[PDB]
Amino acid sequence: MEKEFEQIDKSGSWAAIYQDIRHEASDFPCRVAKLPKNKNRNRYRDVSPFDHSRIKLHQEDNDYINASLIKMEEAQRSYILTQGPLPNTCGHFWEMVWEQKSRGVVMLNRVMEKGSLKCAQYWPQKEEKEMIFEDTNLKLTLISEDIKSYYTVRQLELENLTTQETREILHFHYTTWPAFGVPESPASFLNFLFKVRESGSLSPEHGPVVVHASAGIGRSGTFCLADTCLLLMDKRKDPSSVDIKKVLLEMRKFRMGLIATADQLRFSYLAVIEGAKFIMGDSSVQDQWKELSHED
């Protein structure tokens, strides 16, 4: 399959394939997203959630959050893809997390990128300055954080002021991945994903992991597209059978514009290819990605 990656790469036709995917991609309506009352719950005019897969808030004033429930029946895995919270949807974001019983949050942007804020400071930065969202009646405390060269693994305690309940949310922050860009390498990327897997945030015992970026379509799409494909190869009895193009189109049935650049699409291929080695076997000395990642 890997040489199959070159032939497309020798032809340098990725832009051709990516535009085909863009053309063949599903086109469902987003009536709720475009309602006037929700003009200010959306970071971008052009990224909105389909009405059919959009997450809904159990609150009764408005139920709109720019979040989509991607559910992959064949792989058995679901993710919640969403935009980077805004100054006013931060309580919605953690409300979404709490209601959906999500255990992990995957952040693929940085609050500030290229001199502009793409996201909100929606998690407290100091153990002593807990955050409290009055509208959704939630309180968020920072517990402990592990910082690596390119990612950070915070540990948050989200608590419901109403029921008095509390949960441990894991925060996986990829701090070096730039908008429309690609991770420094597949080794760096695979390292990250596999850390998310082991935390159990992805296990069906919990809600769906929440994955986001500035708009939660480009970098996040590459994340799930890599994750889901690898998930399939261990399942189908012919790991070569996985069609990366087919899978991306399937996700685009739940959220628009997953994967934002022909390059991102290309990297997605490499990550599965390099990651397939772990799934496939990975020599007589696995754990290699741990060494090659350059974490600290």
């Binding site: 970071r43 971008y44 005019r45 052009d46 990224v47 502009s116 500035s214 708009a215 379509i217 480009g218 514009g257 934002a260």
Partner: peptide, 6 residues
Amino acid sequence: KEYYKV
């Protein structure tokens, strides 16, 4: 600014 792709 208000668009994600340009």
